Design a protein around this ligand. Structure first.
Ligand SMILES: O=S(=O)(O)CCNCc1ccc(Cl)cc1
Length: 658
């Protein structure tokens, strides 16, 4: 198809450009498509890119517009006062502003389809909304339109929503172009997707990204594949992984490192209205917060994540119970059988389900996948699916059988409703993952487990020592292994907080010397120091020059291999903002070789101070570039729940940072 109108090189400098005589007479029929390539690295709070209005006195609410906010939200308005119609559709965090100090060219595609009565918006290849209405308003059937405008909406003779920016190109079609056609429009994206809606995870949402560079040169990533919107556990969440063999240019189709099957892998468009957005999957088991390390000695890749039984998250996780019974030095997983009100069973050697009350074994065994067998026969439960068909969240049996697992709601034998940690290993650098195994309790039998710090474990350069950071109330608890993750010991380091989400990431400043950076409740990122390979830990200090909110955000951190200005370098990834999760930065720190203090010398803006930046992952790619995988939105904001494809990957070089 061909355009009815096309223009470009429009500078939007707080002054509207009139294009009425060019466009209005060309509009015909009830379906239209807009394609607009535009930049805005210093937008006003609220600004219209494009407008069709009745500019006459007494019709200030008769217009169509495509507008954006300085938060990076995109939307349209479709209004006609005679018709009684006031459509307003939008999605937060749809835009890029700057990248490597250069305004990004956004590609916007808006489709107004009268046949299907749907309004659809894409930005940079990604569908951001699609709204069906009972009563369709085509964008030029608005009563009395007489202006077509760029960089404002002409209301009653005046410029409303003045835009700052530029439109390199704008095209208009008297047709609703097809989805397949939309995907043929070329893009200028500064980012890539590794995990996306519609891939092999069938999750519509993703949180909690990780990156780690393996010795073979392959770069691995893990992530929460979140099914029930972007909600933390309780929910359905699996841990998925992908890898790149070409320095981050291409990424393998994701597989699962940890997954439960009590609930279907449904790709669900989660409600974003205030009435329904807190809908949360309540009967599913899940995984959350993964962390990756590589073991030199074995060559194994090791991944840990939190494991939640059906309906459990960090708020209802049975505190005061580890879920294991200690029997003369040995920890055994406890089980409750349906019909008993207490936990009478333990899983002993070879998965034998042993009755602690009668002190006899039963005919039941637990296998390697934590599945229940009776006399060697595999038991099953029926799977659940979720839907919103009835106007509220419904979780129901879908007709198919899956292996009965002790983490499931329907299981004959059930684990303690608390938080667990599990590890899986890969022998082929992420091509496949072993069945996970739970880690033993570290803080005693009558105490609920810690929570894993998402991101990277630490492989000490000059030994076989492996360290994963985890947190609980009042301390970081480091998990330490010197035998390839076969056995773990804990090392406790006290922090001056109660009940924090103390997400910690580590770097080795030099051999045996670990600095850990962690999230606090103070508005500042903290750090502590070990000088004996994590055996003991210094008191807590704080970084000046970076701000977080009172609730904080995960921070990622690496030891960079090459000197910068002749010094050893550390790199931190974090929002820099006291207001929200926005203002993303990579911060470059040079180590004082004399005292291990760190000079935070360069702050690189990922995008606009007002555009969202949340949890993140950094790794030095083999070519010495920097790989960044991050939540490109405010993942705390209750206004920005359940956005698709906002976890993005970019490639930077040190020269870009400085
Ligand atoms: O700060 S955020 O709310 O965006 C993420 C915190 N996630 C913490 C957490 C970790 C483990 C479980 Cl089971 C539940 C919640």
């Amino acid at each position: 198809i061909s355009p009815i109108f096309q223009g470009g090189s429009y500078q939007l400098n707080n002054k509207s450009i009139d294009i009425s005589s060019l466009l209005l007479d060309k509009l015909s029929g009830e379906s239209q498509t807009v394609v607009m390539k535009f930049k805005a690295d210093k937008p006003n709070s609220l600004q219209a890119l494009f407008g069709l209005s009745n500019s006459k006195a007494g019709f200030k609410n008769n217009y169509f517009s495509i507008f954006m906010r300085d938060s990076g939200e995109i939307g349209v308005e479709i209004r006609d006062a005679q018709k009684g119609i006031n459509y307003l559709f939008s999605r937060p965090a749809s835009l890029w502003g700057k990248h490597k100090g250069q305004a990004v060219e956004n590609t916007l595609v808006f489709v107004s389809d009268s046949k299907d009565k749907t309004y659809t918006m894409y930005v940079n290849g990604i569908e951001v909304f699609s709204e069906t209405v009972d009563t369709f308003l085509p964008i030029s059937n608005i009563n009395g339109i007489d202006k077509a405008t760029l960089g404002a909406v002409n209301r009653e003779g005046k410029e409303h929503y003045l835009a700052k920016g530029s439109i390199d190109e704008i095209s208009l079609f008297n047709k609703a172009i097809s989805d397949q056609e939309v995907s043929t429009i070329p893009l200028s994206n500064p980012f890539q997707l590794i995990f996306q809606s519609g891939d092999s995870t069938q999750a519509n949402y993703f949180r909690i990204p990780t990156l780690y560079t393996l010795s073979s040169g392959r770069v691995l990533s893990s992530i929460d594949a979140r099914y029930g919107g972007t909600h933390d556990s309780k929910s359905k969440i699996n841990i998925a992984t992908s890898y790149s063999d070409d320095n981050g240019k291409t990424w393998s189709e994701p597989i699962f490192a940890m997954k439960f099957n009590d609930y279907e892998e449904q790709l669900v468009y989660w409600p974003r209205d205030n009435k329904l957005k807190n809908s949360q999957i309540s009967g599913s088991a899940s995984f959350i917060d993964s962390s990756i390390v590589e073991d030199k000695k074995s060559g194994k890749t090791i991944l840990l994540a939190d494991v939640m039984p059906a309906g459990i998250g960090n708020n209802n996780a049975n505190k005061a119970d580890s879920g294991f019974k200690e029997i003369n030095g040995h920890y055994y997983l406890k089980l409750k059988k349906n019909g008993d009100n207490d936990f009478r069973y333990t899983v002993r050697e070879n998965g034998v389900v042993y009755n602690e009350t009668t002190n006899k074994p039963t005919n039941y065994t637990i296998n390697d996948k934590y599945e229940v067998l009776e006399g060697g026969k595999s038991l099953t439960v029926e799977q659940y699916s979720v839907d919103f068909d009835s106007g509220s969240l419904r979780e129901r049996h879908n007709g198919k059988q899956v292996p009965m697992n002790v983490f499931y709601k329907d299981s004959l034998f059930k684990v303690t409703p608390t938080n667990y940690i599990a590890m899986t290993t890969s022998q082929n650098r992420g091509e496949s993952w072993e069945q996970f195994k739970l880690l033993p309790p570290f803080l005693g039998e009558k105490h609920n487990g810690t929570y894993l710090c998402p991101g990277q474990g630490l492989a000490l350069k000059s030994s076989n020592r492996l360290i994963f950071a985890t947190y609980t109330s009042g301390e970081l608890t480091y998990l330490i292994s010197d035998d390839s993750g076969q056995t773990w010991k804990k090392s406790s380091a006290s922090i001056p907080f109660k009940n924090a989400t103390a997400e910690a990431q580590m770097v080795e400043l030099r051999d045996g010397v670990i600095r850990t950076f962690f999230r606090t409740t103070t508005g500042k990122i903290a750090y502590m120091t070990s000088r004996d390979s994590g055996e003991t830990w210094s008191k807590v200090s704080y970084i000046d020059g970076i701000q977080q909110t009172s609730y904080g955000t995960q921070v990622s951190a690496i030891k960079y291999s090459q000197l910068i200005d002749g010094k050893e370098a550390v790199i931190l990834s974090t929002p820099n903002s006291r207001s929200g999760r926005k203002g993303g930065q990579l911060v470059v720190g040079l180590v004082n070789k004399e005292d291990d203090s760190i000079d935070w010398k360069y702050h690189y803006d990922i995008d606009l101070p007002s555009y969202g930046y949340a949890y993140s992952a950094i790794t030095e790619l083999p070519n010495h570039h920097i790989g960044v995988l991050f939540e490109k939105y405010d993942s705390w904001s209750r206004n920005e729940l359940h956005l698709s494809n906002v976890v993005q990957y970019i490639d930077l070089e040190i020269n870009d940072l400085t």
